[PDB]
């Protein structure tokens, strides 16, 4: 009633069992050994089953470093999925992907109830759908793509545009005063940020209403997948059995799919178009179909996806659009203009941009802004080759305004105070909807080109211009 | 590879460009890449060769000038150069024909032309007899005699 | 009118001198994109061919 190891290929281990004792999918295996001779090394290991390959063998993915695995050693099957604590006891603590504490403050005994990670998504008779605004105070976001309570918000950007800056700004502006349970899963980010936010939370007193698990870059490919699931299995309990609204933050969930590409080539699968595992859509669906609202509560999750390059046609980020309810996109080319945040106004959309949910004065200004920006985008080649002075008077007047709108999309964040001489400023929705009206009708458009950069409300623009002479 | 392998057996090929399909000038045969073994003096005669070559060369010449126009403007080019466009537009428009099997899509019965009238009409269009008739009058007409009627209709 | 006609040709000289520059940068960057598109196309083609050969 015990297993063996015969083949090791790095992240993949090809365990073997006897007749009648085959594990199921997602089952957990444990290996313990102590040195019999001085040439051996002591390591305790845990593994996750993924495939059955006949001849009494199953494929498994390692959860820790596989160095020193001598062939012929014994394996233990728990017979149950990986179990991680959940409930009241997990507030304020920090765990690894396996569920043990890594904050060194203490242990968590067995009296705390723990659940399996993998469970099927809710049936159609259990789901619910409602639309209502979640507010953040950001000028560029709140107008052209307001968020929906209990929905999914997606962040898209290259290898550094300010994704983590936006996530921490949202946390500083919403998570503390929202009144709901907060979970932050540090999936695949830098370990420095992971240990910086721990201080940021403990010294600020918010840690009493937060739960976290970390899976940062240093960890082997098997661990980087299940950090998101271990983060979600706690928000699920907070939503269901306690009736609390839950906010969930994930930074590099893309590191899920990439991890699969690392292990699939070793499992023995044929390659996809660009070498991915031929299970991208189904596995991402099985991941994101559990982040849902119900009739008992709502889960709102803000996530970011790592785009492998300045090419959105890549299948892994392109197939993310099948689940998002609000989209925000970043690009380097606008970040380099000196405008932060560099959200593209003609590719960020939201379901909440409807006229019965936001009012006429909101839909009108949103559509007007998008229409005015489209023409300036189209005039790009001809203004670049020959100059802005070529076009006619009616086009020159239009040229006079789009860049000012783009500048007005900039705003100083609260975490930017260490890099800027002013602290973060707040602009409510009723103010961000109002603001674009003045520029569109020409109330303040005559101000110079740089005054609209790094400003809050529209009144600050005029005083900054006066300070400039 | 499939068109490359097919190109080696035809005696005469006519090419269709989707750009001509979108321009609204049917049929979409591009004159430049359409070639045949018949264009020899002993089969079509001398009255055919000179006119066909002149039209072909003019339509090749216009191709790059129209692209230069897209950036350099419309009057920075010399008037002699602009005359090439002024006549090539008419030449390309007159290539359209109102077919008989397209009555469902067109709602029109069509018209009929013999080859003598085709060579004759191209000789007139190069002669300068129709410089003042609008270009849009040449869309989807058959015999050249129809054009003066359509302008009469306008 | 003579002063204006001289300044007109001066302004035209300046206009062409500015216009003739950005073209070369735009060609060099498109040509780079062209080689990258080439290399990507060849790499994808060989990867598909060798995957088929390994399968069969």
């Amino acid at each position: 009633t015990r297993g063996r190891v015969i083949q090791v290929m790095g992240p993949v281990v090809d365990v073997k069992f006897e007749n009648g004792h085959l594990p199921a999918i997602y089952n957990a295996l444990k290996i313990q050994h102590k040195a019999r001779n001085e040439n051996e090394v002591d390591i305790d290991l845990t593994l996750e089953v993924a495939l059955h390959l006949g001849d009494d063998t199953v494929r498994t993915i390692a959860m820790a470093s596989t160095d020193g695995l001598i062939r012929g050693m014994e394996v233990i099957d728990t017979g149950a999925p990986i179990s991680v604590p959940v409930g009241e006891v997990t507030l304020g603590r920090v765990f690894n992907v396996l569920g043990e504490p890594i904050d060194l403050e203490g242990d968590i005994p067995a009296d705390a109830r723990r659940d399996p990670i993998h469970r099927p998504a809710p049936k159609f008779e259990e789901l619910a759908t409602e639309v209502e605004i979640l507010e953040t105070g950001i000028k560029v976001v709140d107008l052209l793509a307001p968020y929906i309570k209990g929905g999914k918000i997606g962040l898209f950007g290259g290898a550094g545009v300010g994704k983590t800056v936006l996530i921490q700004e949202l946390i500083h502006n919403i998570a503390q005063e929202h009144g709901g349970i907060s979970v932050f899963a540090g999936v695949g980010d830098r370990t420095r940020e992971g240990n910086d936010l721990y201080h940021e939370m403990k010294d600020s007193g918010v840690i009493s209403k937060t739960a976290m698990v970390f899976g940062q870059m240093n960890e082997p490919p098997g661990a980087r997948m299940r950090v998101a699931l271990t983060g979600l299995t706690m928000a699920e309990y907070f939503r269901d059995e306690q009736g609390q609204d839950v906010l969930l933050f994930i930074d590099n969930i893309f590191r899920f799919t990439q991890a699969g590409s690392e292990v699939s080539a070793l499992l023995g699968r044929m390659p996809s178009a660009v070498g991915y595992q031929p299970t991208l859509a189904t596995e991402m669906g099985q991941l994101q179909e559990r982040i849902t609202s119900t009739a008992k509560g709502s889960i709102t999750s803000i996530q970011a996806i790592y785009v492998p390059a300045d090419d959105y046609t890549d299948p892994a980020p392109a197939t993310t659009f099948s689940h998002l309810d609000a989209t925000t996109n970043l690009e380097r080319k606008l970040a380099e203009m000196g405008i932060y945040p560099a959200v593209d106004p003609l590719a960020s959309t939201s379901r909440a941009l409807a006229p019965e949910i936001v009012g006429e004065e909101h839909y009108q200004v949103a559509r007007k802004v998008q229409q005015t920006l489209q023409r300036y985008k189209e005039l790009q080649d001809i203004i670049a080759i020959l100059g802005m002075d070529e076009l006619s008077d009616e086009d020159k007047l239009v040229v006079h305004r789009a860049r000012r709108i783009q500048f007005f999309l900039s705003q100083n964040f609260h975490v930017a105070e260490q890099f800027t001489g002013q602290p973060g400023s707040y602009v409510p929705v009723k103010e961000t909807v109002r603001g674009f009206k003045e520029i569109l009708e020409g109330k303040y458009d005559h101000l110079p080109e740089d005054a609209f950069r790094l400003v809050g409300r529209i009144e600050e623009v005029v005083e900054k211009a006066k300070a400039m002479g | 590879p499939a068109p490359a392998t097919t190109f080696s057996h035809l005696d005469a090929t006519t090419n269709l460009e989707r750009k001509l399909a979108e321009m609204g000038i049917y049929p979409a045969v591009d004159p430049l890449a359409s070639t045949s073994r018949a264009l020899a003096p002993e089969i079509v005669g001398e009255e055919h060769y000179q006119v066909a070559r002149k039209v072909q060369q003019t339509l090749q010449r216009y191709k790059e000038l129209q692209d230069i126009i897209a950036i350099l403007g419309m009057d920075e080019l010399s008037d002699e150069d602009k005359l090439v466009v002024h006549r090539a537009r008419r030449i390309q428009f007159f290539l359209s024909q109102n077919f008989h099997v397209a009555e469902q899509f067109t709602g029109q019965p069509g018209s009929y032309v013999p080859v003598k009238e085709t060579v004759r009409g191209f000789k007139e269009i190069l002669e300068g007899k129709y410089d003042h008739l609008p270009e849009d009058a040449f869309r989807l007409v058959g015999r050249i005699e129809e054009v003066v009627e359509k302008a009469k209709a306008m | 009118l003579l002063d204006a006609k001289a300044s007109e040709h001066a302004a035209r000289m300046t206009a062409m001198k500015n216009a003739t520059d950005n073209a070369n940068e735009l060609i060099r960057t498109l040509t780079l994109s062209y080689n990258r598109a080439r290399q990507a196309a060849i790499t994808q083609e060989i990867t598909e061919i060798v995957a088929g050969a390994n399968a069969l």
Partner: peptide
Amino acid sequence: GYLVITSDRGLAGAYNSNVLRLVYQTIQKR
């Protein structure tokens, strides 16, 4: 009475705007 003169065709750069604008402003202002 006022006299204004401009270039006769395009690709002239900013020669055309800088004079038409100023002449127009200086006349409608007064």
